[PDB]
């Protein structure tokens, strides 16, 4: 019993955790074989920030302009490459704690585990998804650039995210691991804003599920609804639109507690409509939409890695 | 900006995760040097659980019929003793990745990190506190016991908690890695039960705290109140009594925001009584008490917004 936002183990991807220094500038990289990834705002100044021509920036450095540092082993780089917003410094060793790994770019609803680091020092694990908007609600302070999101499948880490900025409302953004930035964000200090954010439907349905697997049905009702008459409702409430994919997905969930996907869907309806009366769900007034449906059978199944 | 539930980074921890056999029993142990701390427990058969007599199943053993494995390397036990309720298998290989370490004893409303494992595999970390009734609100399944709870505070892992048991309400018991149990609990299959738990008031002082420095301030109010008019009413919801140490923990939040630890106590006081009204805190609609006041100086800036 229990259902706690849970993280990935974080030991495969702190070994990849260097810090990389360009000028005044520090922020974390991350070191796979013999290439270390980082945003590559770390060759820009404030000014150079305002609008930066990083071709042109990047032209001016030579190998020996990067410190990267690994604990308290200096590595040296001997090659440097841009692709997309990712600066790739080539080092003359390869990590020996490289796991086996995949470059993978996610979609909004799709969550993943952040290592949030300082100075190539991881600092703690928080679980999180990829917001409709683009955006992430992370953690993070100045120092934690270069920051990754990632999931495991069974030995494999599949790295999804690279930390490059904060909006204006606190909210982050960045790229996946070849450089291109999730959302209409650029890496530049220019005026940004988050798009209006929507509610991950699927997901509060596979939390919905989640709840009564550990024993709270309270919000469950005889009732059930078309797919479209539950889209209609979800638009409503800022909800994004439940897909029959996301039916399907949910299929396993349903399943198990015998409680058909539009028959749950109708459960959300009511809550969307009339609250939760003083009620909680899985100890939340809220409901919650950072837990995909494979991350419920993940977790009231017991999966290692 | 933007505050998580964050726990530890766990690799150092994952590096002792080790599968402990006895019998028929498998569950978790933690390998650190040459020993390997398990709940006594796994000795125990099922039907031996009401009334088990340790030291008497403990006699009946030889090294040889407890089975540890580490990967898929099999490890031999040398010697074994008993420590209240944990059995220290000493084995013929210390861990090469033990790290730095030591065993802390956690107080109610301490927090800390779990790491989920099932047969010596990692499955999962997240945060949570020792409630005031000793017991832990973690999310486990069959197989868990043996997973530890630790802080890892400036390169230094300190180990507060091995998990033993699942309560009848779907909570949590355990011990330090002395095995003492937190709490008036056993291991034995008796009838045992988790006493009415209550709010951790100074993690939630904390909280407020955390969100006035991420700069929200809607829930502020033009009032103080006595430390025994706060502890009267507070009571009253179920929320621990506030003491002048817990009041002297808050000094640096208060010095930091501006806002007087019975100032903070007069919000919450009237959070109490009015609710949120729709308003969320820090993206939570239920006043948030596994933060400690340690947490949110380790977590948030040292500049309020
Ligand atoms: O946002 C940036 C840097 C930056 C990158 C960029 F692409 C465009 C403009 C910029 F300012 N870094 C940060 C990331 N996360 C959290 C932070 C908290 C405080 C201060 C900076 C933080
Ligand atoms: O509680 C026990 C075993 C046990 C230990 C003991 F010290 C006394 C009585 C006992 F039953 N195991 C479990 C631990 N955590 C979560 C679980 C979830 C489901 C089923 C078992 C779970
Ligand atoms: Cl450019």
Redo the contacts with the bound molecule.
């Keep these: 019993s229990g259902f706690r936002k849970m993280a990935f183990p974080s030991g495969k991807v702190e070994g990849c955790m260097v810090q990389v220094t360009c000028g005044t500038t520090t922020l974390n990289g991350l070191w796979l074989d013999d290439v270390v990834y980082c945003?590559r705002?770390v060759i820009?100044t404030?000014e150079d920030?305002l609008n930066p021509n990083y071709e042109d920036l990047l032209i001016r450095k030579s190998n020996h302009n990067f410190l990267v540092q690994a604990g308290n082993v200096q590595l040296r780089v001997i090659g440097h490459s841009m692709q997309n917003?990712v600066l790739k410094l080539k080092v003359d060793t390869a990590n020996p704690k490289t796991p086996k790994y995949k470059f993978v770019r996610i979609q909004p609803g799709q969550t993943f585990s952040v290592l949030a680091c300082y100075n190539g020092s991881p600092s703690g694990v928080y679980q999180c998804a990829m917001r409709p908007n683009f955006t992430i609600k992370?953690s993070?302070?100045?120092?934690?650039?270069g920051s990754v999101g990632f999931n495991i499948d069974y030995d494999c880490v599949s790295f999804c995210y690279m930390?490059?900025?904060?909006?204006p409302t606190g909210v982050?953004?960045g790229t996946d691991l070849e450089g291109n930035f999730y959302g209409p964000?650029?890496?530049?200090?220019?005026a940004?804003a988050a798009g209006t954010d929507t509610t991950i439907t699927v997901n509060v349905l596979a939390w919905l599920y989640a709840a009564v697997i550990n024993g709270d049905r309270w919000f469950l009702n005889r009732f059930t609804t078309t797919l479209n008459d539950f889209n209609l409702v979800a638009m409503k409430y800022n909800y994004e639109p439940l897909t029959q994919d996301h039916v399907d997905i949910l299929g396993p969930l349903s399943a198990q507690t015998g409680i058909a996907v539009l028959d749950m869907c109708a459960s959300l309806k009511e809550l969307l409509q009339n609250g939760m009366n003083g009620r909680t769900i899985l100890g939340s007034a809220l409901l919650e939409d950072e837990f995909t449906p494979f991350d419920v059978v993940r977790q009231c199944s017991g999966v290692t890695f």
Aim: charged fraction near 10%; glycine fraction near 8%.
């Design positions: 945003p705002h820009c404030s920030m917003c992370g993070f302070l100045n120092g934690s650039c930390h490059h900025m904060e909006l982050h953004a964000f650029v890496d530049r200090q220019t940004q």
